[PDB]
């Protein structure tokens, strides 16, 4: 038994992290086959970040301006090409440690694992969730730029995030591996702020189902609320509206526990209005919203 | 910025995970050099689990009774010996993925990364802390036996924990990599109970420091306390006594925050007395004690 926030094993991703340096800037890169993916602002100086024109900046750069190091093996940059907001540096050597991989764009409320890296060396791994406001509440320091977010499904790695910048509120923004930013964010130094974040309601319900599976049942009640009556309460507490698809997705968990989705919603409704009155759920004093219904099934097979 | 429970990169440990089968029992094993380490209860028969004599069970087993599989490759068992509660299987092949490693027995209050495994296949990685009662709060299901806990220092993997069983309360117990159990437990299916779980005080102080680094300062206070006066309050609320060494280890966090360790002690003393008053530190209504001072420094720019 037990339920913990779990990251995917990071071995397949570690073998693709290289150190990319351009000028006086150093960040991380993802080495897949003969291509190294890194954020395109590596070609930016500190003073150019105010209003960088990447088209001319990249064209003024030459191949030898890109110092790619895989550990201490120096990789020769054969070419550089713009990939939206990330760079595609071609190297002469394919990565022997290249795993079965795919580029996937996740939706808000979905989770993934982050392999935090500094100077091309992995430092830690944790689990994140794409917030409704298209940011992530990660742990990124200076030089973490280029750290990648991924999921793993049967030895196939689904890369979904690359870290680019930290927003003023401390949350972090980035792109998918195709170079397209999540949310309205752009890779320049402008007055940028994340929108008002909301709580992933379906994830909380999945987490509550995980608590019931593991024996934590004190929050259950005889009540059953309509989908709309729950949603009105949820809006007042900055919770995402629950959709019918969310109810459908929570179907397997409802069957495994024998508790109807709307019955569990009444439990969450009461929890929102009354609080946890000092009690804990799965060792937590807050309503966790970073476990997808899939994330629960993995840790709670039936 | 940002603070999260961060597990070490699991790549070096993934290469040592193998599947061990004995009779009808299958659990995970640790393949280092030409030796496979796994919990000795793999040789237990179904109805012998209540109170087994492993010396009998080992004499009833030969080398070819152990099925060891590293992925698709079957491993030949040359020898087998019992070291306390750990089964050592000698194989004809040294593991080519064996990293630099050592066997250490961590102290209570220390944290380590757990690589949860099933059928010799890693499935997730998360952070665990050795509770003062020598239990850990993890996510272990059937087949997770042999899942290992480790810390990484530079290129060296310090193996410190192998999972053996789950206590009735749902907490988890295991041994060091030499077969010696953490705490008073024995690998039998009896009614064992862990001791009373006190709170790791030095970890709470580090967590409060990690909060100050990440913005949360509401709990902060001007008055200070001596070590002995704080220890009296800590003893009342089942907190571990705070030694001078704990004060020294917290020094780096004090330097980054500009807050004396004894001043943070007074802020914790106030919190233990008047409680939360409905506020949160780092998104939690309770005090976290599963982050060591080293764990906080890893995520904070000193
Ligand atoms: Na209910």
Coordinates of C-alpha atoms and ligand atoms in Angstrom, one line a residue:
Chain A
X1 CA 0.0 0.0 0.0
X2 CA 0.9 3.7 0.1
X3 CA 0.5 6.6 -2.2
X4 CA 3.4 9.0 -3.1
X5 CA 4.1 11.6 -5.7
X6 CA 6.3 9.5 -8.0
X7 CA 8.5 10.5 -10.9
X8 CA 9.3 8.2 -13.8
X9 CA 12.7 6.5 -13.7
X10 CA 15.0 9.1 -15.3
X11 CA 17.7 6.8 -16.7
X12 CA 16.6 7.0 -20.3
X13 CA 16.5 10.8 -20.1
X14 CA 19.9 11.3 -18.4
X15 CA 21.6 9.7 -21.4
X16 CA 20.4 12.6 -23.6
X17 CA 21.4 15.6 -21.4
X18 CA 24.3 17.6 -22.8
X19 CA 25.8 21.0 -21.9
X20 CA 25.4 23.8 -24.5
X21 CA 27.3 27.0 -24.3
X22 CA 27.0 30.1 -26.5
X23 CA 29.2 33.1 -25.6
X24 CA 29.0 33.6 -21.9
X25 CA 25.7 31.7 -21.5
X26 CA 25.5 28.0 -20.6
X27 CA 22.4 25.8 -20.4
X28 CA 21.2 22.2 -21.0
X29 CA 20.3 20.5 -24.2
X30 CA 18.5 17.3 -25.2
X31 CA 20.7 15.1 -27.4
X32 CA 18.4 12.8 -29.5
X33 CA 20.0 11.1 -32.5
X34 CA 22.2 13.7 -34.2
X35 CA 20.3 16.7 -33.0
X36 CA 20.7 18.7 -29.8
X37 CA 17.7 20.6 -28.6
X38 CA 18.2 23.7 -26.5
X39 CA 16.3 27.0 -25.8
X40 CA 16.9 29.5 -28.5
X41 CA 17.8 32.3 -26.1
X42 CA 21.2 30.7 -25.6
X43 CA 22.3 32.9 -28.5
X44 CA 21.1 36.0 -26.6
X45 CA 23.4 38.2 -24.5
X46 CA 22.1 39.6 -21.2
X47 CA 21.5 43.0 -22.8
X48 CA 19.8 41.5 -25.9
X49 CA 17.1 39.9 -23.8
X50 CA 15.1 43.2 -23.7
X51 CA 14.0 42.9 -27.3
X52 CA 15.9 40.1 -29.1
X53 CA 15.5 39.6 -32.9
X54 CA 16.3 35.9 -33.1
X55 CA 16.2 35.6 -36.9
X56 CA 19.2 37.9 -37.4
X57 CA 20.9 36.7 -34.1
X58 CA 21.0 33.1 -35.2
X59 CA 22.1 34.0 -38.8
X60 CA 25.0 35.9 -37.3
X61 CA 26.0 32.8 -35.3
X62 CA 28.4 30.2 -36.7
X63 CA 28.6 26.5 -35.9
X64 CA 31.8 26.9 -33.8
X65 CA 30.0 29.4 -31.6
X66 CA 28.0 26.4 -30.1
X67 CA 30.0 24.4 -27.6
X68 CA 28.2 21.1 -27.0
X69 CA 29.6 18.8 -24.4
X70 CA 28.2 15.3 -23.6
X71 CA 29.9 14.8 -20.2
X72 CA 33.4 15.7 -21.5
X73 CA 33.0 14.3 -25.0
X74 CA 33.1 17.4 -27.2
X75 CA 30.4 17.3 -29.9
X76 CA 31.0 19.2 -33.2
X77 CA 28.0 21.3 -34.3
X78 CA 27.4 20.6 -38.0
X79 CA 24.5 23.0 -38.3
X80 CA 22.1 25.2 -36.4
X81 CA 18.4 25.8 -37.3
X82 CA 15.5 27.6 -35.7
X83 CA 12.7 25.4 -34.3
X84 CA 10.2 28.0 -33.1
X85 CA 11.6 28.9 -29.6
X86 CA 14.2 26.2 -29.5
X87 CA 17.4 25.5 -31.4
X88 CA 18.1 22.4 -33.5
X89 CA 21.9 22.0 -33.3
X90 CA 23.0 19.2 -35.6
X91 CA 26.0 17.2 -34.4
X92 CA 28.2 14.8 -36.3
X93 CA 27.7 11.9 -33.8
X94 CA 24.3 10.4 -33.1
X95 CA 23.6 9.7 -29.4
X96 CA 24.1 5.9 -28.7
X97 CA 21.9 6.3 -25.6
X98 CA 19.0 7.6 -27.7
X99 CA 15.8 5.9 -26.3
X100 CA 12.5 5.3 -28.1
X101 CA 11.1 8.8 -27.9
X102 CA 8.2 10.9 -29.1
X103 CA 7.3 14.6 -28.9
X104 CA 4.0 15.1 -27.2
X105 CA 2.1 18.3 -26.2
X106 CA 0.3 17.7 -22.9
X107 CA -2.9 19.4 -21.8
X108 CA -3.4 21.5 -18.7
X109 CA -4.0 19.3 -15.7
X110 CA -1.8 16.5 -17.0
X111 CA 1.4 15.4 -15.1
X112 CA 4.9 14.7 -16.1
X113 CA 8.4 14.2 -14.6
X114 CA 11.1 16.8 -14.7
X115 CA 14.8 16.0 -14.8
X116 CA 16.4 19.1 -13.4
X117 CA 19.8 19.6 -14.9
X118 CA 22.7 22.0 -14.5
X119 CA 25.7 22.3 -16.9
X120 CA 24.4 19.2 -18.7
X121 CA 24.5 17.0 -15.5
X122 CA 21.2 15.7 -14.1
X123 CA 20.7 16.9 -10.5
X124 CA 17.2 15.8 -9.4
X125 CA 13.9 14.4 -10.6
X126 CA 10.3 15.3 -9.5
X127 CA 6.7 15.2 -10.6
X128 CA 4.9 18.2 -12.0
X129 CA 1.5 19.2 -13.4
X130 CA 0.7 21.5 -16.2
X131 CA -1.3 24.2 -14.4
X132 CA -4.5 25.6 -15.9
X133 CA -2.6 28.9 -16.4
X134 CA 0.0 27.0 -18.5
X135 CA 2.8 27.3 -15.9
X136 CA 4.5 24.7 -13.7
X137 CA 5.4 24.9 -10.0
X138 CA 8.9 23.4 -10.4
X139 CA 12.3 23.8 -8.8
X140 CA 14.6 25.5 -11.3
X141 CA 17.8 27.4 -10.5
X142 CA 20.2 29.3 -12.7
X143 CA 21.4 27.1 -15.5
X144 CA 18.3 24.8 -15.3
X145 CA 17.2 26.2 -18.7
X146 CA 16.9 23.4 -21.1
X147 CA 15.8 20.9 -18.5
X148 CA 13.1 18.6 -20.0
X149 CA 9.8 17.2 -18.8
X150 CA 8.8 13.8 -19.9
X151 CA 6.5 10.8 -19.4
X152 CA 7.4 7.2 -20.0
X153 CA 5.0 4.5 -21.3
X154 CA 6.5 1.1 -22.0
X155 CA 10.2 2.1 -22.7
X156 CA 9.0 5.0 -24.9
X157 CA 9.8 8.4 -23.7
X158 CA 7.3 11.2 -24.4
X159 CA 9.0 14.5 -24.1
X160 CA 6.5 17.3 -23.4
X161 CA 8.3 20.2 -21.8
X162 CA 11.6 22.2 -21.9
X163 CA 12.3 24.8 -19.3
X164 CA 12.9 28.4 -20.6
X165 CA 12.3 31.0 -17.9
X166 CA 11.0 31.8 -14.5
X167 CA 8.0 34.1 -14.1
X168 CA 7.9 36.9 -11.5
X169 CA 5.7 35.0 -9.2
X170 CA 8.2 32.2 -9.0
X171 CA 6.4 29.8 -11.3
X172 CA 8.1 28.5 -14.4
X173 CA 7.3 28.6 -18.1
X174 CA 8.6 26.8 -21.1
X175 CA 7.9 25.1 -24.4
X176 CA 7.2 21.6 -25.7
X177 CA 10.0 19.9 -27.6
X178 CA 8.6 21.4 -30.8
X179 CA 9.6 24.9 -29.5
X180 CA 6.0 26.2 -29.0
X181 CA 5.4 27.9 -25.6
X182 CA 2.7 26.6 -23.3
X183 CA 0.4 29.6 -22.8
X184 CA 0.8 33.2 -23.9
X185 CA 4.4 33.4 -22.8
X186 CA 7.3 34.6 -25.0
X187 CA 11.1 34.3 -24.7
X188 CA 12.0 37.9 -24.0
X189 CA 12.3 40.2 -21.0
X190 CA 9.0 41.9 -20.9
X191 CA 6.5 42.6 -18.1
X192 CA 5.0 39.1 -18.1
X193 CA 2.8 37.5 -15.5
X194 CA 0.9 34.2 -15.3
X195 CA -2.9 34.2 -15.2
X196 CA -4.8 33.4 -12.1
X197 CA -4.1 29.7 -11.4
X198 CA -7.0 27.4 -10.6
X199 CA -7.1 24.0 -8.9
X200 CA -7.3 20.9 -11.1
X201 CA -10.6 19.6 -9.8
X202 CA -10.5 16.2 -11.5
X203 CA -7.1 15.5 -10.1
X204 CA -8.3 16.2 -6.5
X205 CA -11.2 13.7 -7.0
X206 CA -8.7 11.2 -8.3
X207 CA -6.5 11.8 -5.3
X208 CA -9.5 11.4 -3.0
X209 CA -10.2 8.1 -4.7
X210 CA -6.6 7.1 -4.1
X211 CA -7.1 7.9 -0.4
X212 CA -10.1 5.7 -0.3
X213 CA -8.2 2.8 -1.9
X214 CA -5.5 3.2 0.7
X215 CA -8.0 3.2 3.6
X216 CA -8.3 6.9 4.2
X217 CA -12.1 7.3 4.3
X218 CA -12.9 9.8 7.0
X219 CA -14.1 12.5 4.5
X220 CA -16.8 10.3 2.9
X221 CA -20.5 11.2 3.5
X222 CA -24.0 10.1 2.7
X223 CA -24.5 13.1 0.4
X224 CA -24.7 13.1 -3.4
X225 CA -24.6 16.5 -5.2
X226 CA -25.5 17.3 -8.8
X227 CA -22.7 18.2 -11.2
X228 CA -23.9 21.8 -11.3
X229 CA -24.3 22.2 -7.5
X230 CA -20.8 21.0 -7.1
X231 CA -19.5 23.3 -9.8
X232 CA -21.0 26.4 -8.3
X233 CA -19.3 25.6 -5.0
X234 CA -16.0 24.8 -6.8
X235 CA -16.0 28.2 -8.6
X236 CA -16.1 30.1 -5.3
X237 CA -12.9 28.3 -4.3
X238 CA -11.0 28.8 -7.6
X239 CA -11.5 25.2 -8.7
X240 CA -11.8 24.1 -12.3
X241 CA -15.3 23.3 -13.4
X242 CA -16.0 19.6 -13.5
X243 CA -17.0 18.4 -17.0
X244 CA -18.8 15.3 -18.0
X245 CA -15.6 14.0 -19.6
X246 CA -13.9 14.4 -16.1
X247 CA -16.8 12.3 -14.7
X248 CA -16.2 9.7 -17.5
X249 CA -12.4 9.7 -16.9
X250 CA -13.0 9.0 -13.2
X251 CA -15.1 6.0 -14.2
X252 CA -12.6 3.3 -13.5
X253 CA -11.7 4.7 -10.1
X254 CA -15.4 5.0 -9.2
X255 CA -15.9 1.3 -10.1
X256 CA -12.8 0.1 -8.2
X257 CA -13.9 1.9 -5.0
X258 CA -17.7 1.5 -5.5
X259 CA -18.2 5.3 -4.8
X260 CA -20.1 7.3 -7.4
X261 CA -18.3 10.3 -8.9
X262 CA -21.0 12.7 -7.7
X263 CA -20.9 11.0 -4.2
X264 CA -17.2 11.8 -4.1
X265 CA -17.9 15.3 -5.3
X266 CA -20.1 15.9 -2.2
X267 CA -17.1 14.8 -0.1
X268 CA -14.9 17.4 -1.9
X269 CA -17.7 20.0 -1.6
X270 CA -17.9 19.5 2.1
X271 CA -14.0 19.5 2.3
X272 CA -14.0 22.9 0.5
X273 CA -16.6 24.5 2.8
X274 CA -15.4 23.0 6.1
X275 CA -11.7 22.4 5.6
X276 CA -9.8 19.4 6.9
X277 CA -10.3 20.5 10.6
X278 CA -6.8 19.5 11.5
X279 CA -7.1 16.0 9.9
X280 CA -4.8 14.6 7.1
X281 CA -5.5 12.8 3.9
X282 CA -2.8 10.5 2.6
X283 CA -0.4 12.4 4.9
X284 CA -1.3 15.8 3.4
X285 CA -3.0 18.7 5.1
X286 CA -4.0 20.2 1.7
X287 CA -6.1 19.0 -1.2
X288 CA -3.5 17.7 -3.7
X289 CA -4.3 18.4 -7.3
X290 CA -1.2 17.0 -9.1
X291 CA -2.3 13.3 -9.5
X292 CA -4.2 12.5 -12.7
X293 CA -6.7 9.6 -12.7
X294 CA -4.1 7.7 -14.7
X295 CA -1.5 8.5 -12.0
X296 CA -3.7 6.9 -9.4
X297 CA -4.4 3.7 -11.4
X298 CA -0.6 3.2 -11.8
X299 CA -0.1 3.3 -8.1
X300 CA -3.4 1.6 -7.2
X301 CA -3.9 -1.4 -9.5
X302 CA -6.9 -3.7 -9.1
Chain B
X1 CA 13.4 29.3 -7.1
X2 CA 10.7 26.8 -6.1
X3 CA 10.8 23.9 -3.6
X4 CA 9.7 20.4 -4.2
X5 CA 10.5 16.9 -2.9
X6 CA 13.3 15.9 -5.3
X7 CA 14.6 12.4 -5.9
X8 CA 18.1 11.7 -7.2
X9 CA 18.4 10.7 -10.8
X10 CA 17.7 7.0 -11.0
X11 CA 19.8 6.1 -14.0
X12 CA 22.7 4.5 -12.2
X13 CA 20.4 2.4 -10.1
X14 CA 18.1 1.3 -12.9
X15 CA 20.9 -0.7 -14.5
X16 CA 21.3 -2.9 -11.4
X17 CA 17.6 -3.8 -11.1
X18 CA 16.9 -7.5 -11.9
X19 CA 14.0 -9.9 -11.4
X20 CA 14.5 -12.8 -9.0
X21 CA 12.1 -15.8 -8.9
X22 CA 12.2 -18.6 -6.3
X23 CA 9.3 -21.1 -6.3
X24 CA 6.1 -19.1 -6.8
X25 CA 7.6 -15.9 -5.4
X26 CA 9.1 -13.1 -7.5
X27 CA 10.7 -10.0 -6.2
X28 CA 13.3 -7.5 -7.4
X29 CA 17.1 -7.9 -6.8
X30 CA 20.1 -5.6 -6.9
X31 CA 22.8 -6.7 -9.4
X32 CA 26.2 -5.3 -8.4
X33 CA 29.3 -6.9 -9.9
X34 CA 28.7 -10.7 -9.8
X35 CA 26.3 -10.7 -6.8
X36 CA 22.6 -10.3 -6.7
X37 CA 21.0 -9.0 -3.5
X38 CA 17.4 -9.6 -2.7
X39 CA 15.2 -10.1 0.4
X40 CA 15.7 -13.5 1.8
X41 CA 11.9 -14.1 2.1
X42 CA 11.9 -14.9 -1.6
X43 CA 12.6 -18.5 -0.6
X44 CA 9.6 -18.6 1.8
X45 CA 6.9 -21.0 1.0
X46 CA 3.3 -19.8 0.9
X47 CA 2.1 -21.3 4.3
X48 CA 5.5 -20.9 5.9
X49 CA 5.3 -17.1 6.0
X50 CA 3.8 -17.0 9.4
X51 CA 7.0 -18.2 11.1
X52 CA 9.7 -19.5 8.8
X53 CA 13.2 -20.9 9.4
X54 CA 15.2 -19.5 6.5
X55 CA 18.1 -21.9 7.3
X56 CA 15.8 -24.8 6.5
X57 CA 14.5 -23.0 3.4
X58 CA 18.0 -22.3 2.1
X59 CA 19.1 -25.9 2.5
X60 CA 15.9 -26.9 0.5
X61 CA 17.1 -24.7 -2.3
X62 CA 19.9 -25.1 -4.8
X63 CA 21.6 -22.7 -7.3
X64 CA 19.3 -23.6 -10.1
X65 CA 16.2 -23.0 -8.0
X66 CA 16.8 -19.2 -8.3
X67 CA 15.6 -17.6 -11.6
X68 CA 17.4 -14.3 -12.1
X69 CA 16.5 -12.2 -15.1
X70 CA 18.1 -8.9 -16.2
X71 CA 15.5 -7.9 -18.7
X72 CA 15.6 -10.5 -21.4
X73 CA 18.9 -12.1 -20.4
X74 CA 18.7 -15.0 -18.0
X75 CA 21.5 -15.1 -15.3
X76 CA 23.1 -18.2 -14.1
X77 CA 23.4 -18.6 -10.3
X78 CA 26.8 -19.9 -9.2
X79 CA 26.4 -19.7 -5.5
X80 CA 24.0 -18.5 -2.8
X81 CA 24.5 -17.4 0.8
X82 CA 22.4 -15.8 3.5
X83 CA 23.7 -12.6 5.2
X84 CA 21.2 -11.8 7.9
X85 CA 18.0 -10.9 6.1
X86 CA 19.5 -10.5 2.7
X87 CA 20.0 -13.2 0.1
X88 CA 23.2 -13.0 -2.0
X89 CA 23.3 -14.8 -5.3
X90 CA 26.6 -15.2 -7.1
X91 CA 26.2 -15.0 -10.9
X92 CA 28.6 -16.0 -13.7
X93 CA 28.5 -12.4 -15.1
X94 CA 29.6 -9.1 -13.6
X95 CA 27.0 -6.4 -14.3
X96 CA 28.4 -4.1 -17.0
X97 CA 26.2 -1.3 -15.7
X98 CA 27.5 -1.5 -12.1
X99 CA 28.2 2.1 -11.0
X100 CA 30.6 3.3 -8.2
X101 CA 28.8 2.2 -5.1
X102 CA 29.0 1.5 -1.4
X103 CA 26.8 0.1 1.3
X104 CA 25.9 2.6 4.0
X105 CA 23.5 2.4 6.9
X106 CA 21.8 5.8 7.1
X107 CA 20.8 7.4 10.5
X108 CA 17.3 8.3 11.5
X109 CA 16.1 11.6 10.0
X110 CA 18.2 11.2 6.9
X111 CA 16.5 11.0 3.5
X112 CA 17.1 8.9 0.4
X113 CA 15.6 8.2 -3.0
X114 CA 13.5 5.0 -3.5
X115 CA 13.4 3.3 -6.9
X116 CA 10.1 1.3 -6.8
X117 CA 10.4 -1.8 -8.9
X118 CA 8.1 -4.6 -10.0
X119 CA 9.2 -7.8 -11.8
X120 CA 12.8 -6.4 -11.9
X121 CA 11.5 -3.3 -13.8
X122 CA 11.7 0.2 -12.4
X123 CA 8.4 2.0 -12.2
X124 CA 8.9 5.2 -10.2
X125 CA 11.3 7.2 -8.0
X126 CA 10.4 9.2 -4.9
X127 CA 12.0 10.6 -1.8
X128 CA 11.8 8.9 1.6
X129 CA 13.0 9.7 5.1
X130 CA 14.0 7.2 7.8
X131 CA 11.5 8.0 10.5
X132 CA 12.9 8.0 14.1
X133 CA 10.9 4.8 14.7
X134 CA 12.9 3.4 11.7
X135 CA 10.0 3.1 9.4
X136 CA 9.5 4.9 6.0
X137 CA 6.3 6.2 4.4
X138 CA 6.5 5.0 0.8
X139 CA 4.4 3.5 -2.0
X140 CA 5.0 -0.3 -2.1
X141 CA 2.7 -2.9 -3.6
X142 CA 3.0 -6.7 -4.1
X143 CA 6.3 -7.4 -5.9
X144 CA 8.0 -4.2 -4.8
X145 CA 10.2 -6.3 -2.5
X146 CA 13.9 -5.7 -3.3
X147 CA 13.2 -2.1 -4.2
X148 CA 16.3 -0.1 -3.1
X149 CA 16.8 3.2 -1.5
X150 CA 19.9 5.2 -2.3
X151 CA 21.7 8.5 -2.1
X152 CA 24.1 9.8 -4.8
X153 CA 27.3 11.6 -3.9
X154 CA 29.1 12.7 -7.1
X155 CA 29.5 9.5 -9.2
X156 CA 29.0 7.2 -6.2
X157 CA 25.6 5.6 -5.4
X158 CA 25.3 5.0 -1.6
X159 CA 22.9 2.1 -1.2
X160 CA 21.2 2.3 2.2
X161 CA 17.8 0.5 2.1
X162 CA 16.2 -2.6 0.6
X163 CA 12.4 -3.0 1.1
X164 CA 11.1 -6.1 2.9
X165 CA 7.6 -5.7 4.3
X166 CA 4.7 -3.4 5.2
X167 CA 3.6 -2.9 8.8
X168 CA 0.0 -3.2 9.7
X169 CA -0.3 0.6 10.0
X170 CA 0.7 0.9 6.4
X171 CA 4.2 2.2 7.0
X172 CA 7.1 0.3 5.5
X173 CA 10.2 -1.5 6.9
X174 CA 13.4 -2.8 5.4
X175 CA 17.1 -3.6 5.9
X176 CA 20.3 -2.0 5.0
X177 CA 22.2 -3.7 2.1
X178 CA 24.0 -5.9 4.7
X179 CA 20.7 -7.6 5.8
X180 CA 20.4 -5.7 9.1
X181 CA 16.9 -4.4 9.7
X182 CA 16.2 -0.8 10.5
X183 CA 14.4 -0.8 13.8
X184 CA 13.1 -3.8 15.9
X185 CA 11.4 -5.7 13.1
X186 CA 11.9 -9.2 11.7
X187 CA 10.9 -10.5 8.3
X188 CA 7.9 -12.5 9.4
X189 CA 4.2 -12.1 8.9
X190 CA 3.3 -11.5 12.6
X191 CA 1.7 -8.6 14.5
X192 CA 4.7 -6.3 14.7
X193 CA 4.2 -2.6 15.6
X194 CA 6.5 0.3 15.1
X195 CA 7.4 2.6 18.0
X196 CA 6.0 6.0 18.5
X197 CA 7.1 8.2 15.6
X198 CA 8.6 11.4 16.8
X199 CA 9.2 14.5 14.6
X200 CA 12.6 15.2 13.1
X201 CA 13.1 18.7 14.6
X202 CA 16.2 19.6 12.6
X203 CA 14.3 18.7 9.4
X204 CA 11.4 21.0 10.4
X205 CA 13.8 23.9 11.0
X206 CA 15.3 23.3 7.5
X207 CA 11.9 23.2 6.0
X208 CA 11.0 26.5 7.7
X209 CA 14.3 27.9 6.3
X210 CA 13.3 26.6 2.8
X211 CA 10.1 28.5 3.2
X212 CA 11.8 31.8 4.0
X213 CA 14.0 31.3 0.9
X214 CA 10.8 30.8 -1.2
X215 CA 8.8 33.7 0.3
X216 CA 6.9 32.4 3.2
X217 CA 7.9 34.5 6.3
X218 CA 4.7 35.0 8.2
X219 CA 5.8 32.6 11.0
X220 CA 8.9 34.6 11.6
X221 CA 9.4 36.3 15.0
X222 CA 11.8 38.6 16.9
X223 CA 12.2 36.8 20.2
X224 CA 14.7 34.0 20.6
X225 CA 15.2 31.0 22.8
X226 CA 18.1 29.1 24.2
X227 CA 18.7 25.5 23.2
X228 CA 17.6 24.0 26.5
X229 CA 14.3 26.0 26.6
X230 CA 13.5 25.0 23.1
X231 CA 14.3 21.3 23.8
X232 CA 11.8 21.3 26.7
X233 CA 9.0 22.4 24.4
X234 CA 10.2 20.0 21.7
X235 CA 10.0 17.1 24.1
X236 CA 6.4 18.0 25.0
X237 CA 5.2 17.8 21.4
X238 CA 7.2 14.7 20.6
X239 CA 9.9 16.5 18.7
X240 CA 13.4 15.0 18.7
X241 CA 15.9 16.9 20.9
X242 CA 17.9 19.5 19.0
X243 CA 21.7 19.0 19.4
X244 CA 24.4 21.6 18.8
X245 CA 25.4 19.6 15.7
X246 CA 21.9 20.3 14.4
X247 CA 22.5 24.0 15.0
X248 CA 25.8 23.7 13.1
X249 CA 24.4 21.8 10.1
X250 CA 21.6 24.5 9.8
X251 CA 24.3 27.2 9.6
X252 CA 24.3 27.4 5.8
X253 CA 20.6 27.9 5.7
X254 CA 20.9 30.6 8.4
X255 CA 23.5 32.3 6.3
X256 CA 21.3 32.4 3.2
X257 CA 18.3 33.6 5.2
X258 CA 20.0 35.9 7.7
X259 CA 18.2 34.2 10.6
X260 CA 19.9 32.6 13.6
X261 CA 19.1 29.0 14.2
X262 CA 17.9 29.8 17.7
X263 CA 15.6 32.5 16.3
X264 CA 14.1 29.9 14.0
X265 CA 13.8 27.7 17.1
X266 CA 11.6 30.4 18.7
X267 CA 9.4 30.7 15.6
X268 CA 8.9 26.9 15.7
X269 CA 8.2 27.0 19.4
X270 CA 5.5 29.6 18.8
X271 CA 4.0 27.4 16.0
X272 CA 4.0 24.3 18.2
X273 CA 2.0 26.3 20.9
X274 CA -0.5 28.5 19.0
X275 CA -0.7 26.3 16.0
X276 CA -1.4 27.2 12.3
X277 CA -4.2 29.8 12.9
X278 CA -5.4 28.8 9.4
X279 CA -2.3 29.8 7.5
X280 CA 0.1 27.7 5.3
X281 CA 3.8 27.3 5.0
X282 CA 4.7 26.2 1.5
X283 CA 1.2 25.2 0.7
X284 CA 0.8 22.9 3.7
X285 CA -1.2 23.3 7.0
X286 CA 1.2 21.0 8.8
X287 CA 4.9 21.1 9.6
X288 CA 7.0 19.0 7.2
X289 CA 10.0 17.0 8.6
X290 CA 11.1 14.9 5.6
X291 CA 13.6 17.5 4.2
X292 CA 17.1 17.4 5.6
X293 CA 19.3 20.5 5.7
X294 CA 21.3 19.0 2.8
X295 CA 18.0 18.5 0.9
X296 CA 17.1 22.2 1.2
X297 CA 20.6 23.3 0.2
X298 CA 20.3 21.2 -2.9
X299 CA 17.4 23.3 -4.1
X300 CA 18.6 26.7 -2.9
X301 CA 21.4 28.9 -4.2
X302 CA 23.9 29.3 -1.3
Ligands
LIG1 NA1 -19.5 11.1 -0.1

